[PDB]
Design a protein around this ligand. Structure first.
Ligand SMILES: N=C(N)c1ccc(Oc2ccc(NS(=O)(=O)c3ccc4ccccc4c3)c(Oc3ccc(C(=N)N)cc3)n2)cc1
Length: 241
């Protein structure tokens, strides 16, 4: 997260850190039930030197605050049993950039570990609404990851504006969130994490999944996120949630 601040401990108890064995934190995710996380598909693509698509190569840390204190009280470590990448995910366009991760053992709910609410398929997160992005990604483009979880406030951008800022790249599964002036944005390592939106009674709903961007925090280049309402039924069908 660029242009953000340290989160308070336990402030985003649905925020999850995915580590690939021997590589440390690679992506974020969000806890949605005791057995399931939401993340981005693109985090689980093989490259010639590592099988990121193999669930056994991962560890999820729930209730984490500081990457250097992964054994702190309240942090829960879990392995993955399965990674379900959306069948329509396109690794070139990043369309349908969403995945479901099945925990090998259920998360134990606590003050530090709690699921985020999922929005109904018909819900519209309106243009202009303030929402939050969180993660341990880079704090400057080409910079370094954050040890302490970061948070940043960004706003939903009109889809036509989004499409015009990133020509031939924005599909209806995507949403631009940020500022045309730049300043606050997600960045490398924040991928897969949730956009958190404060709704009518203060409960937080997941608005989207961190997906990609052209650089980070640059003017006229807001971050691109996978929308969540569109996938409510897919999530229910594949997880029971
Ligand atoms: N021309 C380029 N070089 C370019 C342009 C766009 C790209 O898109 C990507 C690719 C990988 C990433 N992210 S990611 O964290 O770097 C990433 C990359 C490879 C992975 C492999 C396995 C597992 C996880 C992996 C994770 C990305 O993340 C961003 C970047 C910017 C923003 C933003 N400004 N809001 C948000 C998320 N974005 C990637 C590359």
């Amino acid at each position: 997260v660029v242009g953000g601040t340290d989160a308070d401990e336990g402030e985003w108890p649905w925020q999850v850190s995915l580590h690939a064995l021997g590589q440390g934190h690679i992506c974020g995710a969000s806890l949605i039930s005791p057995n399931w996380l939401v993340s981005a598909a693109h985090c689980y693509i093989d490259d010639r030197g590592f099988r990121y698509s193999d669930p056994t190569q991962w560890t999820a840390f729930l209730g984490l605050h500081d990457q250097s204190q992964r054994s702190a009280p309240g942090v829960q470590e879990r392995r993955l049993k399965r990674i379900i990448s959306h069948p329509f995910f396109n690794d070139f366009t990043f369309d349908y950039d969403i995945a479901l991760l099945e925990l090998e053992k259920p998360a134990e709910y606590s003050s530090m570990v709690r699921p985020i609410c999922l929005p109904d398929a018909s819900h519209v997160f309106p243009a202009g609404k303030a929402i939050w992005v969180t993660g341990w990604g880079h704090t400057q483009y080409g910079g370094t990851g954050a040890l302490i979880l970061q948070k940043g406030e960004i706003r939903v951008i009109n889809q036509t504006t989004c499409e015009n800022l990133l020509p031939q790249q924005i599909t209806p599964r995507m949403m631009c969130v940020g500022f045309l002036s730049g300043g606050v944005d997600s960045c490398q390592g924040d991928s897969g994490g949730p956009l958190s939106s404060v709704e009518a009674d203060g409960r937080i709903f997941q608005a989207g999944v961190v997906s990609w961007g052209d650089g980070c925090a640059q003017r006229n280049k807001p971050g691109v996120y996978t929308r969540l309402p569109l996938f409510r039924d897919w999530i229910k069908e594949n997880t029971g949630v």
